[PDB]
């Protein structure tokens, strides 16, 4: 439901969604059947207010899925996996991620144009980086990726002999405290939803840079803009458009209005990142980005350090190795997935150079 929160015009907001945002950053939505009262959180500040509040849970209205947990059990599991995303860990991983990116751009430059960038480059790249971060053994990566019992069997086996990566760390440091199913669940979230979001950022972000050739070249002239460019790209794309509802556990005042106990709040990251026409233009020279593309609060994207590193490496290397890159069809013909709660993405991206 609430399909209006996902209406777009290519990468931008649809007029119907812009009109909704004019009703304020916090919109009360009583259901027509009188079964519940829902809320739309559409503004940057209000979305952060909701997501930072302790007075909401993620009740429904799979083991190892942090998004389906509330404190204290959410805290318990997240604290065990968080060290895998430390700065020290990303620094040690960076050169290997660079090499994986180079592997896939090697394949791309050798196949010669054209290429379907989503299936042939972005997808495999994201899945291979995920395998490296997780520490998947080499002989299991091909099958694990093809699959996008096996997971439980894989998790139990790697749990017996801890290796490298996040999965080895967790099992090595929290062997008895995490089960096979929970480990498998941590792996699945990384290999499934996470790759979907990352691959979409890679493909749609490449399209976004191609539609702004001045900045495509600027990122090549000044690769130090990579970190800034990533923040602007994830803000502009908002591939994770809307969040699971947050239900108020008690009466709480948000954005000047009282959200009653039991009412559900739907945060629109898309609206929060894009509704403000001031400072909405795509501009990678912006030194600081105002966005909630990775969420906020206790459920803030645990993989943001990896996503930010991988995307920086990918975009900077791409613009450098393919200065002549261009869409093989007019940009206006690219197909985007119709409105849905699923990750936002294009369906294919034919490129040549
Ligand atoms: C490297 C790949 C990624 C991995 C492994 C990853 C893993 C996660 C995990 C495990 C959570 C749940 C945290 C919790 O509930 O405590 C999470 C939350 C989130 N991730 Fe990431 N993520 C990754 C890349 C992204 C990307 C590319 C985006 C979009 C730009 C993204 C947008 C989010 C959002 C919006 C949430 C919060 C959902 C909510 O609060 O309801 N993630 N991510």
Numbering used by the authors: 5 to 65, 76 to 162, 180 to 384
Article sentences:
Cytochrome P450 enzymes (P450s) are a superfamily of monooxygenases that utilize a cysteine thiolate–ligated heme moiety to perform a wide range of demanding oxidative transformations. Given the apparent preference for the unusual heme orientation shown by OxyA enzymes, we investigated the OxyA homolog from kistamicin biosynthesis (OxyAkis), which is an atypical GPA. Structural and biochemical analysis of OxyAkis has shown that this P450 enzyme is highly prone to oxidation and can display an atypical heme orientation in different protein batches.
Thus, we sought to crystallize OxyAkis alone, and we were able to identify conditions in which the P450 would crystallize and diffract to high resolution (1.6 Å). With OxyAkis no longer in complex with the X-domain, we observed some changes to the flexible regions of the P450, noting that the loop connecting the F and G helices could no longer be resolved due to lack of clear density and suggesting that this loop is stabilized in the complex. Additional gaps in the structure of mobile sites surrounding the heme and active site were present, suggesting that these regions are disordered without the bound substrate, which is in keeping with results from many structurally characterized P450s. Given that P450s from GPA biosynthesis are overrepresented in the structurally characterized P450s bearing the alternate heme conformation, we explored various ratios of the heme orientations that could model occupancies (2:1 ratio) of a flipped heme ligand in the structure of OxyAkis. However, even once the density of the methyl/vinyl groups was well-explained by a mixture of heme orientations; there was still evidence for additional density at the side of the heme immediately below the I-helix (β-position).
